[PDB]
Amino acid sequence: LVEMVQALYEAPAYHLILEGILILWIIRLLFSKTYKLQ
Amino acid sequence: AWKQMSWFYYQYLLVTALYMLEPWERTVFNSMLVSIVGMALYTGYVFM
Amino acid sequence: NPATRVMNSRGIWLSYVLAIGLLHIVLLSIPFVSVPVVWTLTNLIHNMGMYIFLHTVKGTPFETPDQGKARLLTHWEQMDYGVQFTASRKFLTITPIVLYFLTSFYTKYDQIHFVLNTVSLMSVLIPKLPQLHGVRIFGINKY
Amino acid sequence: IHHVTQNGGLYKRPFNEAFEETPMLVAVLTYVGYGVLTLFGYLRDFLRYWRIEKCHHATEREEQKDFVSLYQDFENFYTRNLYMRIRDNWNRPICSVPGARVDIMERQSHDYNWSFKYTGNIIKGVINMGSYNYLGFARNTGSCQEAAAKVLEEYGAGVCSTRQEIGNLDKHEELEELVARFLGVEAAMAYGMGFATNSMNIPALVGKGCLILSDELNHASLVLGARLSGATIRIFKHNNMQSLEKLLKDAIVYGQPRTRRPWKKILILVEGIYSMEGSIVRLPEVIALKKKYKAYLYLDEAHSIGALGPTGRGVVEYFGLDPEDVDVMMGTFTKSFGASGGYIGGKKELIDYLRTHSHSAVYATSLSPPVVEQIITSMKCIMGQDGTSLGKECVQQLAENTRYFRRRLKEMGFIIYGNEDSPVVPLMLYMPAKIGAFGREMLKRNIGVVVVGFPATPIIESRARFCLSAAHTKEILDTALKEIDEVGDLLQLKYSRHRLVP
Amino acid sequence: DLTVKEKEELIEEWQPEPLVPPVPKDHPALNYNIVSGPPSHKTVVNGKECINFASFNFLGLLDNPRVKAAALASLKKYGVGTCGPRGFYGTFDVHLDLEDRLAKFMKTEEAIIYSYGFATIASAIPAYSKRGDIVFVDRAACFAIQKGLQASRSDIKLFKHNDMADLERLLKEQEIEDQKNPRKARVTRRFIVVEGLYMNTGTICPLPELVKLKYKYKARIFLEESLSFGVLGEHGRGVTEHYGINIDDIDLISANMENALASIGGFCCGRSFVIDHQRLSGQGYCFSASLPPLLAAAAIEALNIMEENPGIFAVLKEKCGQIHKALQGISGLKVVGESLSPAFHLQLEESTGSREQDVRLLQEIVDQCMNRSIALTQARYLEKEEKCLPPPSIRVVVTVEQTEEELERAASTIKEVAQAVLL
């Protein structure tokens, strides 16, 4: 898959930014407590 | 060699829960099970 | 409720990760398709099935546990007795995100596949926010 | 003597059991068959919307087509797509006295269990492992079925009033005095339905302001009686004495849910034997916790009174404990005496209270005299009172039968749940299509068993339940063990990873 | 918050209340009568011989020699108990035979039998009615109906006794809320729960107007007639035959096999569409042992006699309006009930003002009548557990075994002792 890896370099600006925001959504959701709703 | 071979079909019928379906339901599942594998060798031959 | 403890049972995560892995081989066996289109179909079909089974069908498939206290709640809202951020509610929140990083990489980062996969990912992640626990957008699907 | 705990429970003899886990491949294979059935259920629902005939079942009247529909179609989804496919092994009618061998009416179906037809034949001599006949008192010839005939002749079938109006005979007075001598308590009281001894007397003891602590696997009557009382309900893990203490300590520091006032009182509902699980309660630790936290205990021994203990007194005798350390004891007469009804024993002020404030005492009719004469005679037989050693022999025979059966199955290679002294033996068979196959293949071989599926158990925990009795000879029991092997080979039911060795 | 040192102080200072309350003073009950022998027509109660006017067997079928032969012949081949719950080798051929005979007697489509008379209507109501439904219940319903309603977490709206204007006013109000939110009104069920020949009052429900209201406001009916089954009608089919109403209009019908059948248990009869649902949903049918076969063999034999001789129902009613007319005139006692009811009341006219003083007063009449060989009873309730507690009373219960001389001699004794305790 030569083409695929050489295309992440030329990935648009607004996309790799969405994949960075989505990686922070996981980390914040992978460290929560529990809190049954009152 | 027949009895032995017939026993594996019985085990196949239990592991997949076709032992408790009607004949037409059984044929509908056995038809699309063989087609997918059939078109899985054709795609693994042209692209090889 | 016997239906809230299903998503915890032994071997249910590995049995689920193989349900997506088996659908990706039956879709990639088609003789006349493309690899980029095989990875978009996987993502959209999985997200639509997950959306229907977690956020549209409400009630149980068997006699309601106690006089029908869950006849108006989708399977997501019944799960784990309403307790948030359990392991089973974190697995099902992370899985569509991980399956998006692969269908972005295998489509080469195209521009038209983006407007499809992003719309599907948002559609499957919006209902899982704790702020929407019971809200029915414009009345739809309430009774 | 043998060992203790940090709680302070004293165990006189070893307390050993086993709940081996499901192997991973078998669990993975169960979900395949539970999804394949669901897919076809959706397809059949679609076809039955306007394309399949399906004229074999019932509908609403023509005049009530514009009322709101009576049922919600999605609730009876598993009923019409799963249960209905293999429901030919759940309501088998029998035509003789049930014990150690029964006669079953032969029925057949043509439209896949949607309707049945009795041919006219009878399957005689079927080995019975499906009914609760511990100690073997269910017979139609003997000295207990001899006196019931006398009482019936002079009294009649049943009474026609309540205990508080004119339905208080001297038979009731004669039986309630004997039950207290049996249990070792001060006073007792008998009702007439085992299910209604719980749901009509629990709401007479607690109300709003009180707390109920229930075990995970309680009977339906115990759960309904709590729902009708008005108290708060909290469930702890099965037989977990750490969960109970953690849930019992956190209720005396935090009080009631909103106002945070002290609870009026706390009640604990447990059972002697859990019939679907095959386990025995850890009573010396439950007693050593409700004395340290000042809670009250409610014991339900419908599956152990007469089936545990050196002299057939139940779990309190089986553990070597003092009967007076239990606030309420309740049981039935329908599992070991071959009769009907239920009882409650305890202190003398408690029974005095319940005689006036119980729903059954004032609204429901009394017991039947011919049934009371069954219980009085078999209870005297067990006490060694009649004069023979029948009560002792029958009590001991069940213990050896249980030990032999449970030991043989382990060597054979199956997965068996529960405690080693339990007369209920659940055999594990996980896949959903083996539920329908085991019941069908055992009856072809002259054995009667019960099977249980998903919306009664966990998802991957299907099982077959065997009940032993003191009427099972060693030659019946060997025949059953020999025929279980063949079906276990034919259906591949030997999942145990570490089998026993003779 | 809350260090691990003061938690023991909290755990240590707590003090529960006793399991049962200490008795404040003298009570009413706690003095059961002790009947020696069977409670037949001539009974011995508390060591004295007396005529029974207190038991609920209107057909004299208890000590019928023919009924006992059919029970012994079933004891001789089955034993006494069923060792299981009707879904695990607990159904016999006797159970299916009795179910068919009941369904054929009521001219219905299907029937289901329970093993306990109280659990029949306490399990049937919560199997159809659920968390978001409206139930309209008469104000004088019995206790089993109230418990079944309590166990079904639905909305209860209880209306006056036997008046159709209040029921219609209650239904019209519900129609106004249906026009305020039509989406929710299409998933909400409406049940009317009524009771032919009420027990707490001795009256009879007006059925032809209640049927008309059913089709006008679209609400199903649940008839509960365990005191008119085998009493009313010209065949003992209940109230539906008394009024001449098509039985396909009453949805579900319930009764017990304990009064006029003189046995144990209850049954529900209806269309196969509604009766088939309770076999997997009724709590007391699915988790309890089934009825002993010798008790189901007695009901079939009683049901044979009920069909062979249908002139036994005219006898019961001819001498039912005899003692209802021979009692009018007592000073201080009033009669509450219909001329067609075999079990009515004698309530106290113009009560003092303290219930405890009326329960204590009526017991003087009962205890002094029983010394003249006439056995009577008092109605018992659970004072703190009742929606609409009725006044104290004395049940007068008529059977076919009581001769006319005994009936006319009972009125004299009741009047003699009552105009000398209430003076």
Numbering used by the authors:
A (entry chain E): 10 to 47
B (entry chain C): 9 to 56
C (entry chain D): 11 to 153
D (entry chain B): 45 to 546
E (entry chain A): 51 to 473
Question: What text appears in the publication on this structure?
Answer:
To elucidate the molecular defects of the ceramide binding mutant, we then determined the structure of the SPT-ORMDL3 variant containing ORMDL3-N13A mutation at an overall resolution of 2.9 Å for the monomeric complex. Structural comparison of this ceramide binding mutant with WT SPT-ORMDL3 reveals little conformational variations, except for two evident local structural differences. Firstly, the ceramide-like density basically disappeared in the ORMDL3-N13A mutant, corroborating the largely disrupted ceramide binding by this point mutation. Consistent with this, the purified ORMDL3-N13A mutant demonstrated a decrease in ceramide enrichment of approximately 30% compared to the WT complex. Secondly, the N-terminal 10 residues of ORMDL3 became flexible in the ORMDL3-N13A mutant, explaining why this ceramide binding mutant is no longer able to suppress SPT activity efficiently. Several residues that contributed to the intramolecular polar interactions at the ORMDL3 N-terminus in WT SPT-ORMDL3 structure, such as Asn11, Arg15, and Tyr91, exhibited apparent structural shifts in the ORMDL3-N13A mutant. We suggest that ceramide binding might trigger the conformational changes of Asn13 and the adjacent residues in ORMDL3, which could induce and lock the ORMDL3 N-terminus into an inhibitory conformation. Although the SPT-ORMDL3 (ORMDL3-N13A) variant displayed a similar Vmax value to that of the WT SPT complex, the Khalf value of this variant toward palmitoyl-CoA was nearly two times as high as that of the WT SPT complex. This suggests that in the absence of ceramide binding, ORMDL3 can still inhibit SPT by reducing the affinity of SPT for palmitoyl-CoA substrate. The Asn13 in ORMDL is critical for ceramide binding.
